[PDB]
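User: quick one
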Amino acid sequence: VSPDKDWYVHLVKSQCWTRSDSALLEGAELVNRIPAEDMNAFMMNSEFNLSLLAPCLSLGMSEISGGQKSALFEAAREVTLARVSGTVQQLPAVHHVFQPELPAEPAAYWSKLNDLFGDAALYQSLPTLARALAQYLVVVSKLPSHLHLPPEKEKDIVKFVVATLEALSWHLIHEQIPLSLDLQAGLDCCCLALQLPGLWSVVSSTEFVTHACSLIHCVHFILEAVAVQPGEQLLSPQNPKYITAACEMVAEMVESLQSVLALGHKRNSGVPAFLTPLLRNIIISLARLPLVNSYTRVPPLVWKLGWSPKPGGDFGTAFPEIPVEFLQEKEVFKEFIYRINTLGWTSRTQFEETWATLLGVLVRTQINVLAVQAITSLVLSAMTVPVAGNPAVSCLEQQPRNKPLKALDTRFGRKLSIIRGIVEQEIQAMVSKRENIATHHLYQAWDPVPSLSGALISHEKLLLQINPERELGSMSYKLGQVSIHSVWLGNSITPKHRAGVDIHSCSQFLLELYSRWILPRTPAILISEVVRSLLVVSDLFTERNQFELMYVTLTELRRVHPSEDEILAQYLVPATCKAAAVLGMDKAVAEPVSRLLESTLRSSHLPSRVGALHGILYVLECDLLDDTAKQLIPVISDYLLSNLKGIAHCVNIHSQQHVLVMCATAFYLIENYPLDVGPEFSASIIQMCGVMLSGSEESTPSIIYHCALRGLERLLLSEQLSRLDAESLVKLSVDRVNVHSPHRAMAALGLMLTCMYTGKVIVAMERVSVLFDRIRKGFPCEARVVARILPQFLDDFFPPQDIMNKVIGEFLSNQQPYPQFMATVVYKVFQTLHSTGQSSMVRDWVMLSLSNFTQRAPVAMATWSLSCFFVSASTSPWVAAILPHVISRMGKLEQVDVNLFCLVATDFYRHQIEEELDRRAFQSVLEVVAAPGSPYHRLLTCLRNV
Amino acid sequence: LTEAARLFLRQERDARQRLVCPAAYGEPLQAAASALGAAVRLHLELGQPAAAAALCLELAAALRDLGQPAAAAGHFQRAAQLQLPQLPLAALQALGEAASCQLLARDYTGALAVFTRMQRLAREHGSLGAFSDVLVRCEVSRVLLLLLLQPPPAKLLPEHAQTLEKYSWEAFSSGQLPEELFLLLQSLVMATHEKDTEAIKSLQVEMWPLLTAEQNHLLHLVLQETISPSGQGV
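Assistant: Done. Structure below.
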């Protein structure tokens, strides 16, 4: 047979036109190689496995996220959208709410429905299409202009998500619990469709009210079926009845977010913990609907009183803003705060309404503290990057202190970039708090770092920038959110208003009302909260007179307030440091910040010292600290050494915020002040970090391990190091790769990759040996990742003659637990040799298939390894493009397998050997193995026929 | 310092769960480390090991409520260690909570190392009626975790080898499990080891009523790792 385009396409149809979820990744890789011009006639065919649209979309996205244009992604997107429109054109014309309890009310409808979703010939295609649609919608936020979802398909996608949740709930009513993947796909489409503004403008309109109440009814019924046993309620203390039902159901759900859907609560133990994030996000996005938003923001304790106006909002449920004479009661105020903080604000008018409300409450014992906290959180709400008042879409905007590394954007740097982005992707997926992420998709993590030149900065450009003091994946407000350089850079401050909402007026009003409120018998618990609110809002101050007023207020407060506060200093010190170091810390007045820091670092209780360290980090940001009057440096370094030498053997005992901020300060000192932070000062903590990274999984928590390790990776990657502690750093990296925890092994592997790519003969062989050992005795995740980074490591460190024996020896082994990965490693290596004109070394090594191959007790595995090897060492396309097909069958000695193996070996014998004496040398190895059995004897016959 | 614990935890539970405050310094936790985390050590150094760990059982539950699963798991395990060689049931409940938190942290090889410790303490101390309620959760958990991780034969302890061996037709028996759950577990082990998707899907749909929420999470994870493996980058 001629192994050509048509043979290949037939072989692709043999695996990607069934209905089976065995080898979906390899199926996507096989469809990838189909000609781009003839790919959509291949996926829009009625037999196509619809379970491949998620792997095809993921592979296309990984090809586009790599910059290159992807045609498989275009095909999979076209097919997903066409299939969605198709499966939506079957639903009945008019839509009735899906009262998941009302006994079949629209009989005809509720029967024309069952006939279209009670059967498995269509219902089975709803979640396998929802998986594709959720894999598409989760990456529309990072696509080009012509790859977003069109404006025409938005109504159809809303109807499809409605129908998918309706079908899932119908299954739950009649049949048993659908499936974990079906549930997940339906809720994923729901969440990701209410997360996009293009579809949020369609669901939340007026002709889609029945669909909104269907979503609400179905989500409530699913939460009831999943989270509670039959016979109990969710919580443990005119117009279409369904509208009021929807209002009350969303109110109950929002009230549940505190207990039943709070991950780790004593009541969330009923939800299977893979539905908690999806349901939280869906409930938030539903509560923000204009239909139910007006009702949802009113606490229940208001209806428990005599409040019941006559509403109207084109639905009949637009209630007015709570009369502030109700919030003077505490519990009602705390519930209102919870509603407006969890839900955020849906528009500028709503921000202004709740602003004026909390102002009227702000004018009294403790209502003032609650009002101040609500106010500061409310102004911080406009800080978020993606969509400003949307807690489902957005997270708090942070500009890190660390500048982009200059070692990258080089020759070796741009290769370390790739091979460390891989390891970082996996460390993200394996240890990140998926806090800004709701769905299950792994390779989706992003960071809230908008450019200060704006559009969000792509995550693969933030390798070692994100302040090494915040937990990997944690997006809450951390003290030190916005760096001071960012303050000088965004609004040009010599050392406007936020999204849709005038924050200059809010900031100025708050600054005047705070200054006039703490300088002259205000209680202590009020002064401390005003200072905390000032520190938190000073992330939104724009002018320099705002910061100067803040500084003069805070220093007069320091002078007036007594020293016996201990709970005011935690916010007095970092706020004063932020102000004084935005003013370009000078000698005249911004100098006695060093005295304040020196005094607060010898404190008695920890939070004052953590605040002092955040203030120190605020100063060095780009102040000439002190002004070459840096006499704070010796103090900072002595404190850091004395209090990190103790907390290095037992770390889980001491607080984690303290250790994290101490490490962040130490790394900033070593990298930015390497001539004042003494010399060995680095090595000293490159030992503290050694005694911390080398601890057992109990003696070193995971987040502290990953900070210290990523900070060390930056310290080495930044050229601000002597070659004496860097030499002390290349040794520590290798002792941590042979660890049991897979994510710790992956972190140590990333540090080793930087130790190798930055500081640049048998050492390289020791390192490749440890990599092969992590393939051979690791978990499938870690082993797949290491085998995915290995081809580049190999082709970039040592010439192919050195390791070509080792790669084949690790492929052909009995101690090899995952030969299905080493197949791809050998493939990448050989196909790299077929580009650099070294296609003669590869044949020299394949002619070394005498004893290594053809000698493997499971003859099935012997012929499988022979087929993998002869596919790898093939200069022909359509033969090298079937390795995903041969990896999908690691045993399975069928007859078509043998036909494949004979064809592949015949192609090799015809195209690569070309030497008759070597041809006979090749022929007289199947005769020793002989095997009159099918595989070799058929190969010998076909070779005699050639 | 035990009612001060209530004060300084509610002063954090307010801003976290009651009135969600997306403006938290993170201030009352680094201080929540006092009283609780503080006497946690004081109780020991002066001596009250019996109830000393109860303070940590409250502080760990608080930490898990706030969204710190890993440190909550650490404190839970420490409590289990503190109460162990005097009270089996207390430390077994603590270890169960620690395994739950570690599964919240997506730390599977550390959760399996606690399930194996429970399962092996329940036996060597089952010499009641709840021991054969931890041996029925730990066995199913451990099997689902070993099916999710899939360790290679090299780094696979004798314990896990014995367990994953118990559930193939070379073996029939039920130990402490109910017969139907054992048959489902055996069919699931045999179907996953033989790269069978539809069998595992049918088994997920059939087993959902018999498994708890944690183990249903784990069975969904097994099914997902089977369908779309984690590490390919796509």
